[PDB]
Amino acid sequence: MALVLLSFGVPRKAILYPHEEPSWSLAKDIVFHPYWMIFGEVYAYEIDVCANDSTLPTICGPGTWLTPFLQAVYLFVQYIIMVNLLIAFFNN
Amino acid sequence: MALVLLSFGVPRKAILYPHEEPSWSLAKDIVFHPYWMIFGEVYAYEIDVCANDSTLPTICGPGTWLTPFLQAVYLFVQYIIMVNLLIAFFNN
Numbered sequence: 001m002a003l004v005l006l007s008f009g010v011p012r013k014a015i016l017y018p019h020e021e022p023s024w025s026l027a028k029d030i031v032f033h034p035y036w037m038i039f040g041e042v043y044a045y046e047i048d049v050c051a052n053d054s055t056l057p058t059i060c061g062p063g064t065w066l067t068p069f070l071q072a073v074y075l076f077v078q079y080i081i082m083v084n085l086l087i088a089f090f091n092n
Numbered sequence: 093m094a095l096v097l098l099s100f101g102v103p104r105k106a107i108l109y110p111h112e113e114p115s116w117s118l119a120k121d122i123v124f125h126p127y128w129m130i131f132g133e134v135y136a137y138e139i140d141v142c143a144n145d146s147t148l149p150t151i152c153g154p155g156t157w158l159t160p161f162l163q164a165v166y167l168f169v170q171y172i173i174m175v176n177l178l179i180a181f182f183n184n
């Protein structure tokens with residue numbers, strides 16, 4: 001699960017924040033939102049940053065249309081597969 | 093589950109957005125919000141678009157009172173039936 005989290009977090013930050021200098025905040029930002037997604041927070045108004053109802057209108061830029069596809073895959077893997085594998089692990 | 097998603101998404105968009113011209117955004121809008129509903133996002137202030145606390149007051153129009161009934165059925169089928177069938181699948 002931790003690996004799936006990073007496999008999503010790193011591309012998301014890289015696509016949405018392409019003009020960043022090196023900083024330890026990068027370590028926070030690749031792990032922070034992907035973790036809270038496991039616990040029922042999809043960040044609904046940040047998914048499509050170029051939509052009218054977006055809370056991140058300044059992040060709208062080239063390639064940002066990729067991040068909803070990434071997040072859709074991420075949560076499928078975490079909830080539909082990995083959370084329920086863990087339920088099945090504990091039941092058995 | 094993907095079929096249940098479309099069975100909800102298409103009516104929702106059609107009832108709430110009746111004055112749309114053909115566009116590929118239609119493909120996004122029939123699948124987008126119904127998918128994020130699977131992962132704990134009910135879009136609480138968009139359900140009844142004619143309420144005072146609604147975030148979509150301009151969408152208020154004829155027939156829009158139908159969409160809460162549709163969404164109530166949709167989530168019953170997805171969480172109460174289909175998510176727990178999948179848990180039962182993995183356990184067994």
Ligand SMILES: CCCCCCCC/C=C/CCCCCCCC(=O)O[C@@H](COC(=O)CCCCCCCCCCCCCCC)COP(=O)([O-])OCC[N+](C)(C)C
Nearest residue numbers: 050051060061062063064065066069116117119120122123
């Ligand atoms: C069942 C329901 C679905 C039906 C499916 C039919 C598919 C039809 C395909 C339609 C694609 C064309 C639509 C957009 C028109 C082109 C220009 C455009 O507006 O681009 C938009 C983004 O989107 C893109 O740039 C490309 C999107 C391609 C992926 C679409 C899904 C492909 C099928 C599934 C793939 C999964 C794998 C499938 C195989 C397993 C621009 O949007 P923006 O982000 O707001 O950018 C503007 C702002 N900016 C200038 C600052 C950036």
Ligand SMILES: CCCCCCCC/C=C/CCCCCCCC(=O)O[C@@H](COC(=O)CCCCCCCCCCCCCCC)COP(=O)([O-])OCC[N+](C)(C)C
Nearest residue numbers: 048050051052065066068069072094116117119120123127
């Ligand atoms: C292997 C399985 C494959 C699954 C199916 C294939 C995948 C789904 C196919 C979808 C069709 C493709 C949509 C193209 C729309 C183009 C419109 C556009 O301008 O850009 C959009 C595309 O950019 C995005 O970022 C949104 C992409 C949709 C993500 C869907 C994730 C949910 C997965 C669902 C999976 C369940 C599937 C259910 C069963 C079918 C973004 O719009 P915008 O940024 O707001 O642009 C400004 C526009 N405005 C000014 C009007 C606001």
Ligand SMILES: CCCCCCCC/C=C/CCCCCCCC(=O)O[C@@H](COC(=O)CCCCCCCCCCCCCCC)COP(=O)([O-])OCC[N+](C)(C)C
Nearest residue numbers: 140141142143144150151152153154155156157158159161
């Ligand atoms: C246990 C607790 C529940 C008790 C049940 C008792 C039921 C009593 C029934 C009451 C119906 C009458 C109430 C509304 C008065 C009529 C006019 C009105 O205000 O309409 C409102 C909408 O609603 C409708 O237009 C019709 C709603 C009908 C469905 C109600 C549920 C029926 C039972 C269950 C059905 C499920 C299946 C059942 C069988 C299995 C207008 O609201 P709006 O959207 O804000 O529109 C105004 C704005 N606009 C002008 C822009 C549009």
Ligand SMILES: CCCCCCCC/C=C/CCCCCCCC(=O)O[C@@H](COC(=O)CCCCCCCCCCCCCCC)COP(=O)([O-])OCC[N+](C)(C)C
Nearest residue numbers: 139140141142143144145156157158159160161163164165
């Ligand atoms: C098979 C099983 C059947 C289940 C029971 C039957 C179903 C439930 C029956 C409900 C009674 C019917 C309500 C009528 C109210 C009319 C009022 C009105 O003006 O319009 C409203 C009706 O329009 C809507 O869109 C809301 C409809 C309620 C959806 C309920 C979904 C939850 C299901 C629950 C299932 C669990 C049931 C629990 C066990 C009983 C909308 O109001 P508005 O748009 O804000 O209008 C402006 C008003 N304002 C100015 C004041 C803001």
Ligand SMILES: CCCCCCCC/C=C\CCCCCCCC(=O)O[C@@H](COC(=O)CCCCCCCCCCCCCCC)COP(=O)([O-])OCC[N+](C)(C)C
Nearest residue numbers: 015018019050059060061062063064065066067069070073
């Ligand atoms: C493997 C398939 C090969 C690829 C082709 C087939 C894929 C679909 C077809 C084509 C791709 C989508 C084309 C539409 C977008 C082009 C327009 C555009 O500029 O869009 C954006 C950039 O977009 C890019 O720069 C394109 C990046 C593509 C990355 C690869 C896609 C993943 C394919 C994996 C597929 C696996 C499916 C799932 C697994 C089953 C927006 O840029 P802009 O905002 O206009 O720029 C202005 C910037 N300025 C304001 C700063 C000046």
Ligand SMILES: CCCCCCCC/C=C\CCCCCCCC(=O)O[C@@H](COC(=O)CCCCCCCCCCCCCCC)COP(=O)([O-])OCC[N+](C)(C)C
Nearest residue numbers: 107110111142151152153154155156157158159161162165
């Ligand atoms: C099958 C039973 C037969 C149907 C009748 C009995 C059903 C129960 C009750 C009654 C039906 C609803 C009547 C109340 C609303 C009327 C007032 C009105 O205008 O409302 C709206 C429109 O509404 C319509 O145009 C009505 C659409 C009905 C669709 C069918 C209902 C589903 C029945 C399935 C039942 C299955 C139960 C679940 C399964 C167990 C609001 O319009 P407006 O905003 O005022 O318009 C102004 C527009 N302007 C501003 C642009 C000018």
Ligand SMILES: C[C@@H]1CC[C@@]2(OC1)O[C@H]1C[C@H]3[C@@H]4CC=C5C[C@@H](OCCC(CO)CO)CC[C@]5(C)[C@H]4CC[C@]3(C)[C@H]1[C@@H]2C
Nearest residue numbers: 003006009010020021022023024025026027028029030031
């Ligand atoms: C298997 C995993 C692959 C991914 C990964 O883990 C292992 O690989 C690690 C490499 C790390 C970076 C290395 C060096 C620096 C330079 C530093 O420069 C100070 C700048 C400023 C501070 O404010 C001075 O004022 C800032 C931090 C940064 C960019 C690291 C960020 C985290 C990264 C990307 C880690 C990431 C989580």
Ligand SMILES: C[C@@H]1CC[C@@]2(OC1)O[C@H]1C[C@H]3[C@@H]4CC=C5C[C@@H](OCCC(CO)CO)CC[C@]5(C)[C@H]4CC[C@]3(C)[C@H]1[C@@H]2C
Nearest residue numbers: 095098101102112113114115116117118119120121122123
């Ligand atoms: C089993 C499922 C039943 C439902 C469904 O899948 C299979 O059936 C598909 C038919 C599709 C539409 C066909 C043609 C067009 C015309 C095009 O015209 C360019 C306009 C503009 C673009 O910006 C030019 O500038 C826009 C797209 C649109 C309306 C399609 C939308 C998606 C639809 C509704 C699909 C839907 C998900």
Ligand code: NA
Nearest residue numbers: 039040131132
């Ligand atoms: Na939740």
Ligand code: NA
Nearest residue numbers: 040041132133
């Ligand atoms: Na939640």
